[PDB]
């Protein structure tokens, strides 16, 4: 199971859009049109729409799949991370997006969720005190998010591994078929407020 880690240093208000920019970019690449199966086992694939998202707290624009429900799902759990970050303080958090297949297991054991890929975005929130803080921050993280999306595209293009196309009965072990307008790969979004760890040895 492959892992990629990204870091962003962002102001408090810009944490939501910065996360949506990362999550949507990954899920745009990690989803397809919905499958409509025929009794013969064949299936058609629907069309995915995309739309631009202008960020307000960041001078930045990203592309997400045009599913209104997927957006509501991520904005909600991004808000869970946002609220948890401010309830805690100082010694800083991370959100994780993981894709997994469902494997069948003999009774009594329930089905195995087997990750094939996970993304972790570590978040550092900085405090600002003049208005020049906020404006140059709006520019600076936008340029930083450009680097991240470029790095996401460049790991996504490795074509490392992908689960094989499921049959009509296997479909819910590979895809999240619960949405109206896109079927992502089965994904899990959890977050975690971590501690701050020092640095030991230079190595100068």
């Amino acid at each position: 199971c492959r892992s990629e880690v990204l870091e962003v240093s962002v102001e408090g208000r810009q944490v939501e859009e910065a996360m949506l920019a990362v999550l949507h970019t990954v899920l745009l690449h990690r989803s397809t049109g919905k499958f409509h199966y025929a009794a013969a086992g064949t299936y058609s694939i629907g069309t995915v729409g995309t739309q631009d998202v202008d960020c307000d707290f960041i001078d930045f624009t990203y592309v997400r799949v045009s599913s209104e429900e997927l957006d509501r799902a991520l904005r909600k759990v991004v808000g869970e991370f946002k609220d948890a970050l401010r309830n805690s303080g100082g010694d800083l958090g991370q959100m994780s997006l993981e894709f997994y297949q469902k494997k069948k297991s003999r009774w009594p054991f329930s089905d195995e969720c087997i990750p094939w890929e996970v993304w972790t975005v570590k978040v550092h929130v900085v405090a600002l005190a003049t208005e020049q803080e906020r404006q140059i921050c709006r520019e600076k993280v936008g340029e930083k998010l450009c680097e991240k999306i470029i790095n996401i595209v460049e790991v996504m293009n490795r074509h490392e591994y992908l689960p094989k196309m499921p049959t009509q009965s296997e479909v819910d072990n590979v895809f999240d078929t619960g949405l109206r307008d896109v079927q992502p790969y089965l994904y899990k979004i959890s977050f975690q407020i971590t501690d701050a760890l020092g640095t030991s040895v230079t190595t100068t």
Partner: protein
């Protein structure tokens, strides 16, 4: 093998047609927004909703002249800037090459077809995170587009331009490479 390559030629042709749409619509000053369909139509290429602009289609077909990328022959979409002064400036050259090396194991049709779909998705993403994007929407300046076909010449970019890899897709006829060089 004759039908499969007839299909692959079509896939590459419409991939090239669609990259030109994606690149030009992203330099269009306005936000782009399309809608998914569970009951799609027969002209939603690569399972993506990309509306064709006729005029752009026209000179994508005039540039290609009924031909497809290949050896030493790579399609280029040049994004430029004419200011109030009138001096031109090459902002980005978008380059769709077709490398020599092949992938005889990659199973046409839809392995290639699905991977080209992902590349158009990567292209939609990368087309907004290059500085010519924010420039094209903050509108004094005007953006010009132009498509041509052969070897690529990066001279108008100026010394020290950066390049972005959008991604690659291997085909039995050669591996497609999509990238951008920008000043």
């Amino acid at each position: 093998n004759s039908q499969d390559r007839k299909d692959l030629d079509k896939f590459i042709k419409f991939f090239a047609l669609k990259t030109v749409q994606v690149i030009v619509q992203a330099r269009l000053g306005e936000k782009i927004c399309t809608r998914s369909s569970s009951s799609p139509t027969g002209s939603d290429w690569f399972n993506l909703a990309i509306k064709d602009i006729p005029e752009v289609t026209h000179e994508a077909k005039k540039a290609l002249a009924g031909q497809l990328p290949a050896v030493g022959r790579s399609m280029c979409v040049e994004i430029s800037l004419k200011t109030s002064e009138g001096d031109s400036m090459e902002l980005e050259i978008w380059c769709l090459e077709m490398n020599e090396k092949c992938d005889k194991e990659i199973k046409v049709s839809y392995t290639v077809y699905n991977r080209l779909s992902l590349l158009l998705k990567s292209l939609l993403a990368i087309t907004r995170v290059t500085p010519a994007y924010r420039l094209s929407r903050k509108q004094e300046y005007v953006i010009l587009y132009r498509i041509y076909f052969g070897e690529v010449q990066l001279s108008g970019l100026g010394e020290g331009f950066q390049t972005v890899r959008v991604g690659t897709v291997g085909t039995p006829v050669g591996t497609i490479t999509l990238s951008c060089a920008y000043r």
